[PDB]
């Protein structure tokens, strides 16, 4: 039962159309709880979960100040990277930043993450030892030199082993009713004849939380991938998730195939057979 | 809670 807290920032330049569009989102595991949009009228960090509204004005003022700072630094980074790659002002470019921390089922610190990307492409990242940086190209090398000079790694490690984990624990306790719950996947199977000699078996897992789930197909008890098809886990919209896995079988041999479901909300993984 | 430092590429 590990948990995580994650902050995502996206900044998209709009040449000739004003300032860059900035969107920030905060997640605890698979639940979004804060949000900032530079095109919104509020100009403040806004709640997205009910358990974060307990925080007083000091928390929201501080959060709004830091999200403004992230917006400003991203805007400056856009022009800086435009200079690093000798790019003109005609093109629209995107800078993304993500950072956060993981804790185990004991809520002990596991790992911290801090990384950037430019135009959909990896740029710089904190290494696993939380002591150094990995640069994806030779401009990120200059960024890494700047960050090593300023000893950014130590301040970041202090944040990741301190404020990040402590406030993740605080949110998991204040939102205990929804962050620490586990919704088992409600499963069911569908049958559809595709021809006179073949059919399609689709097993569904619905209304589960968290999003991590495993759906596998077995024929005669052996893993099968030949005529199988899985969809990406998708949000239902009410806070839970959905997924299904299908397989094409010879009509009349449905009993040879089983669908195996693995999730945190189920003590024993489920086995679904058509009949 | 977010990070305090004013970081630039």
């Amino acid at each position: 039962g590990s948990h995580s807290m994650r902050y995502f920032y996206t900044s998209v330049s709009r040449p000739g159309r004003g300032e860059p569009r900035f969107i920030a989102v905060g997640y605890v595991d698979d639940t979004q709880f804060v949000r900032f949009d530079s095109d919104a009228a509020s100009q403040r960090m806004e709640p997205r979960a009910p358990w974060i509204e307990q925080e007083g004005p000091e928390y929201w003022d501080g959060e709004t100040r830091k999200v403004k700072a992230h917006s400003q630094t991203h805007r400056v980074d856009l022009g800086t990277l435009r200079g690093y790659y000798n790019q003109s002002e005609a093109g629209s470019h995107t800078v993304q930043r993500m950072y956060g921390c993981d804790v185990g089922s004991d809520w002990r610190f596991l790992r911290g993450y801090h990384q950037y990307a430019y135009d959909g492409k990896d740029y710089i990242a904190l290494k696993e030892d939380l002591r150094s940086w990995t640069a994806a190209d030779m401009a990120a090398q200059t960024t890494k030199h700047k960050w090593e000079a300023a000893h950014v790694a130590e301040q970041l490690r202090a944040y990741l082993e301190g404020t990040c984990v402590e406030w993740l624990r605080r949110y998991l306790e204040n939102g205990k009713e929804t962050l620490q719950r586990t919704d088992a996947p409600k499963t069911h199977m569908t049958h559809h004849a595709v021809s006179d000699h073949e059919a399609t078996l689709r097993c569904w897992a619905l209304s589960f939380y968290p999003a991590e789930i495993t759906l596998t197909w077995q024929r005669d008890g052996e893993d099968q991938t030949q005529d199988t098809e899985l969809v990406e886990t998708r949000p239902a919209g009410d806070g839970t998730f959905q997924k299904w896995a299908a397989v094409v079988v010879p009509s009349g041999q449905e009993q040879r195939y089983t669908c195996h479901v693995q999730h945190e909300g189920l003590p024993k993984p489920l086995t679904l057979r058509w009949e | 809670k977010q990070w305090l430092v004013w970081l630039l590429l």
Binding site: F8, T10, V12, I23, V25, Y27, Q32, R35, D37, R48, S92, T94, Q96, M98, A117, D119, G120, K121, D122, T190, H192, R202, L206, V231, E232, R234, P235, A236, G237, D238, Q242, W244 | -
Partner: protein, 100 residues
């Protein structure tokens, strides 16, 4: 510069039931850059009251969005999702299949 084509899924929030209110969802994922056009169509006409989630992205930096609207599935009404992106030469229309 990286560009990723959007994967598209059209589905209801709850199992479809004719005459019972539900939510129609178009989930677009794994695309880059973030500029994207998504429309929810009823019988080919654009639904107006369409909401969407806040722009987030995965570990590989590809974005994902969920567009949704309240609707009532019937036996005759056709629903779909029209998506346009820079990677898509011809806009993709994914028709809603209640068993997908």
């Amino acid at each position: 510069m990286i560009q990723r084509t959007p994967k598209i899924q059209v589905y209801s929030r709850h199992p479809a039931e004719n005459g019972k209110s539900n939510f129609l969802n178009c989930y677009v994922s794994g695309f880059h850059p973030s500029d994207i056009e998504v429309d929810l169509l009823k019988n080919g006409e654009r639904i107006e009251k369409v909401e969407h989630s806040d722009l987030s992205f995965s570990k590989d930096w590809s974005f994902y969005l969920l567009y949704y609207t309240e609707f009532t599935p019937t036996e005759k009404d056709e629903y779909a999702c029209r998506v346009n992106h820079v990677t898509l030469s011809q806009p993709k229309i994914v028709k809603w299949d209640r068993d997908m």
